[PDB]
């Protein structure tokens, strides 16, 4: 009534994440993924993720953000989060998580599968150097409705990837600390975990960056000052002028 | 131009039989048209509102050489008892969308590919 929304298909990872991983057990294995063994491993992973999320709240996220903002590394904050979760043991949910983990065969394969399932961003530098147009679809779209939809979507995906990466780091640290308590062949696993921890940490850092930016408000600044800054930057050789349509929201 | 009723077609006869609906005196049935430009085929997406359970049924309009017309049953999609606000069906990806407002005044709507196997499931939005 009055306004408008678009119904956009959730990505594979987001659609799976928004549904509890336990219910994924009731959906065909070839539908969850093409690799049935990989599908089972990922189903166990997402069951663990939902298990963690059922106890992790948004206030936890806020205090984690403050812990990162004032001096503390995100690895230390994640250690503190997992330590609080373990100290809150009344049922030993870590044992349930470990039981679900034995269902996973060589969890390095499954975690790298999540890595490839989320990899859609690649290291390329795109400056304002115009590419050769092939359709008029190059200039097509860019309206204010598109802007609103894109900003809502990036906020939502930033939040989802935020939660997913936090859970991934928590699970990495927990599995590294568990060692051989019900596990075998941990001699090679832990060293790979030591190597994969910093990379997931930097990925979490980037996704925290994007989520923080999506949470950041912006002030109403005159387009006159905007274009003055544009001219100054072009003079100092950090930007090249490109103008199609600039909008400031109301 | 003939000013006469050529035939009376029962939509439930092209579906596996449902006895109660055809004798039910319910009201609120809905018809939707979907034309395939490249196929020259017109599809009737008919929501028969049954107090038991409403249903979507997909038909194709067929006009024989003797001015006798019939409905070719492609699929039928049952629905749970709700106040159906709207429904659509597309032939480009061959899909049913349905939007209800339940008796608790809550907006619900879902989609399903009505050629993606035939025994009962819906994808929520």
């Amino acid at each position: 009534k009055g306004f408008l929304s678009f119904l956009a298909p959730c990505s594979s990872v987001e659609h799976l994440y928004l549904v509890p991983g336990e219910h994924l057990l009731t959906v065909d294995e070839s539908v969850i993924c093409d690799d049935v063994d990989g599908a089972s491993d990922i189903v166990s992973l997402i069951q663990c993720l939902h298990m963690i999320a059922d106890y992790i709240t948004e206030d936890m996220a806020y205090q984690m953000e403050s812990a990162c903002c004032h001096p503390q590394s995100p690895e230390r904050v994640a250690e503190q989060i997992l330590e609080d979760l373990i100290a809150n043991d009344i049922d030993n949910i870590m044992e349930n998580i470990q039981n679900k983990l034995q269902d996973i065969r060589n969890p390095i394969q499954a975690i790298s599968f999540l890595l490839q399932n989320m990899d859609y961003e690649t290291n390329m530098d795109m400056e304002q150097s115009q590419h050769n147009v092939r359709l008029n679809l190059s200039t097509l779209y860019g309206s204010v409705t598109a802007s609103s939809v894109v900003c809502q979507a990036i906020y939502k995906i930033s939040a989802t990837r935020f939660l997913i990466c936090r859970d991934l780091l928590i699970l990495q640290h927990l599995l590294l600390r568990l060692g051989d308590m019900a596990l075998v062949g941990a001699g090679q696993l832990l060293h790979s975990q030591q190597e994969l921890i910093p990379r997931a940490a930097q990925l979490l850092l980037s996704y925290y960056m994007i989520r923080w930016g999506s949470q950041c408000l912006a002030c109403a600044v005159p387009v006159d000052l905007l274009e003055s800054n544009l001219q100054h930057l072009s003079v100092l050789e950090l930007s090249d002028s490109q103008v199609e349509k600039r909008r400031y929201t109301s | 131009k003939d000013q006469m009723c050529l035939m009376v077609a029962d939509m439930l006869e092209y579906v596996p039989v449902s006895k109660d609906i055809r004798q039910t005196a319910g009201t609120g049935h809905k018809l939707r048209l979907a034309y395939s430009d490249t196929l020259e085929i017109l599809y009737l997406g008919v929501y028969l509102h049954t107090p038991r359970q409403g249903q979507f049924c997909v038909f194709q309009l067929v006009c024989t050489e003797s001015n006798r017309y019939s409905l070719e049953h492609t699929s039928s999609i049952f629905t749970n008892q709700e106040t159906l606000i709207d429904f659509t069906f597309t032939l480009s990806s061959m899909n049913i969308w349905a939007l209800w407002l339940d008796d608790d005044n809550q907006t619900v709507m879902k989609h399903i590919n009505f050629e993606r196997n035939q025994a009962g499931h819906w994808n929520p939005v």
């Binding site: 119904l7 298909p9 204010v144 109301s250 | -």
Partner: peptide, 25 residues
């Protein structure tokens, strides 16, 4: 490969700026 189950999600469109079309009576 086999099959495709998809769920849509609501993304609010409309104008970030405040402007709506008034009906011509």
């Amino acid at each position: 490969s086999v099959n495709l189950e998809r769920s849509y999600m609501e993304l609010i469109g409309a104008e970030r700026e405040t402007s709506r079309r008034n009906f011509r009576d």
